[PDB]
């Protein structure tokens, strides 16, 4: 569900990605770390919401969801429920219900100067031969020798 053009509870009411998303996703299983012998109930997800979230929009509202015509005054009932639910992670749960750690990287390039990008690959230095050289973007052809 963490991909452009998807649908589902997570893709709609938990985390929505833009359709022109730049960057990408790295995810890996973390059962050996996020699992408890008695059941780990520390991770929540939103189950009830009126409408889908906009891309890159977070919602930490913890008001009681209204599922009927009667507006409750903050006390849960037959049609008033907490919109957050706890996961049932268990280390013996089958693959598909096991915890996974997910990171999404998004690259933004603005009119401002570019600042974040990869290391520059340098080669060795040789002297006393006519070569093509490139030092810090300055290119040329010639022989390099020791100076005073």
């Amino acid at each position, epitope marked *: 569900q963490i991909a452009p053009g998807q*649908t*589902g*509870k997570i893709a*709609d*009411y938990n985390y929505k990605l833009p359709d022109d998303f730049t960057g990408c996703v790295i995810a890996w299983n973390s059962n050996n770390l996020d699992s408890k012998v008695g059941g780990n109930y520390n991770y929540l997800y939103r*189950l*009830f*919401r*009126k*409408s*889908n979230l906009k891309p890159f929009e977070r919602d930490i509202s913890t008001e009681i969801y*209204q*599922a*009927g*015509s009667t507006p409750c005054n903050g006390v849960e*009932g*037959f*049609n008033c*429920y907490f919109p957050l*639910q706890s996961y*049932g992670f*268990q280390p013996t*749960n*089958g693959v*598909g*219900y096991q915890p996974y750690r997910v990171v999404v990287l998004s690259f933004e390039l603005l009119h401002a100067p570019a600042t974040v990008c990869g290391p520059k690959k340098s080669t060795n230095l040789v002297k006393n031969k006519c070569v093509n050289f490139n030092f810090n973007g300055l290119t040329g052809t010639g022989v390099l020798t020791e100076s005073n």
Partner: antibody
Framework: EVQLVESGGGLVQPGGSLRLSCAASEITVSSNYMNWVRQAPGKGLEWVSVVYPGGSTFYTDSVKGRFTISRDNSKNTLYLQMNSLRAEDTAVYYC????????????????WGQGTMVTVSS | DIQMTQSPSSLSASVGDRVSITCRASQSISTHLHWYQQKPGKAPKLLISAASTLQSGVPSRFSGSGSGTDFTLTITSLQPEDFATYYCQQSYSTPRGLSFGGGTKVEIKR
């Protein structure tokens, strides 16, 4: 007074179109998980279509491409459009509510309709 | 593509008997299953939620248990109106994994 009433059933010739209506009272169709499940006469139950409060819909393999589900807020109703039916579609349709009940029965069906009969034969 | 097998297909019992109904899955589904009761001529009714939690408005005589690939329902005293069809339904697979089970019917023993 939570109440769900089905309407629009009947007999149709094979390959036609049909429309089912689910009227819900004391609950909101636009803000709740709504479901259509058909049961063949004498057989077991089989999920057909589901709609989320946010507007997303799902259909099963045998019905996808021919079955449509939509909502109406002014009438607080649910509409089910059948295109290119077949004899295997003859069943009884229940309009159901998903993830309800007092104890927070997530994904458990506690509210159904009386059902409507859909027959496809010539 | 999860399928459930419900046992027995039919059970014969009298008033005041204990009834045990099992259903088994081709794969472990934790506790994402609910038990329903449907009588002929009317829509099914939810009895047990999450395979272990009794629903509000349900008699306390019924109980549920089991885990993983095997789920059990236990009835202590079978009242004369308890003769109906019993179902167990799962909601394990998230996107479209909603599938239904076979079912067990209970009739009067003589």
């Amino acid at each position: 007074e939570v109440q769900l009433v089905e309407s629009g059933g009947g007999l149709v010739q094979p390959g036609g179109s049909l429309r089912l209506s689910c009227a819900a009272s004391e609950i909101t169709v636009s803000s709740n998980y709504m479901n259509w499940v058909r049961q063949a006469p004498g057989k077991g139950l089989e999920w057909v279509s589901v709609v989320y409060p946010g507007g997303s819909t799902f259909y099963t393999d045998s019905v996808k491409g021919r079955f449509t589900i939509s909502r109406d807020n002014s009438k607080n109703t649910l509409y089910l459009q059948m295109n290119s039916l077949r004899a295997e579609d003859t069943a009884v349709y229940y309009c159901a509510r998903e993830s309800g009940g007092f104890p927070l029965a997530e994904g458990a069906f506690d509210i159904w309709g009386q059902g409507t009969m859909v027959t496809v034969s010539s | 593509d999860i399928q459930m097998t419900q046992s027995p297909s039919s059970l014969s019992a009298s008033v005041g008997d204990r009834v045990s109904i099992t259903c088994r899955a081709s794969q472990s589904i934790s506790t994402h299953l609910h038990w329903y009761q449907q009588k002929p001529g009317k829509a099914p009714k939810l009895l047990i939620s999450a395979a272990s939690t009794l629903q509000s408005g349900v008699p306390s005589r019924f109980s549920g248990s089991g885990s993983g690939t095997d789920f059990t329902l236990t009835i202590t005293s079978l009242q004369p109106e308890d003769f109906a069809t019993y179902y167990c339904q799962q909601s394990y697979s998230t996107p479209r994994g909603l599938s239904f089970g076979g079912g067990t019917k209970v009739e009067i023993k003589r």
